[PDB]
myeloblastosis associated viral protease (Avian myeloblastosis-associated virus), 223 residues
Amino acid sequence: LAMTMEHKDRPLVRVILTNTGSHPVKQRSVYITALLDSGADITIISEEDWPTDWPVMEAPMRKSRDMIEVGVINRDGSLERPLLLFPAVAMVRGSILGRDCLQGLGLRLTNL
Amino acid sequence: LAMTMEHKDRPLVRVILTNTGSHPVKQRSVYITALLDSGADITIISEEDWPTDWPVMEPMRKSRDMIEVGVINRDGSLERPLLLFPAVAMVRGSILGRDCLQGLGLRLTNL
């Protein structure tokens, strides 16, 4: 993953979310768009992007009850190694990959 | 600038702000600390960091004077200054948005 910071365009990526829990659900995997956000401590899936039957627990933010597998997809369709998280769920303008995820991908902010 | 993304550390930098207007001010340049926020479209200075005689125009407000922004690295080296009209708001920490990020030529990368 390598994305140039641009004022006018948000650093958006496509992500594959996979519910890995035992609880039965309509769709095990979904595709979403999420912002690479260096200012967020943790990852948050918007209420709009979160599957209705995917259970949440009172962490305003709720937290995924189940462990989610997160697959970041590069602009050319190449895949980063997946991460296992328990994302937050909230009413935010869009899904956000926080520093828990940025760290897991081994990202750095640089001009070198 | 090179900063590893870590869950436990907020990517904070020291910044020098300089008011470039005509009118007198008590302090023309101040030191603050701010967060590098790729999720922020615009740079925002907390009201707590913003000098009181530095005018704003009409929740956020925009600086009336053009402000020079110089990021200072941990080791004290200076990055190239940028000219902007930052927003001022009731946040609890100043934020450097992508307006500054792009000016700095930054990239998010594992390569």
Observations:
- The first strand of chain A starts at residue 2 and ends at 4.
- The interface with chain B takes residues 1-7, 10-11, 35-42, 80, 96, 98-100, 102-103, 105-112 of chain A (CB under 8 Å).
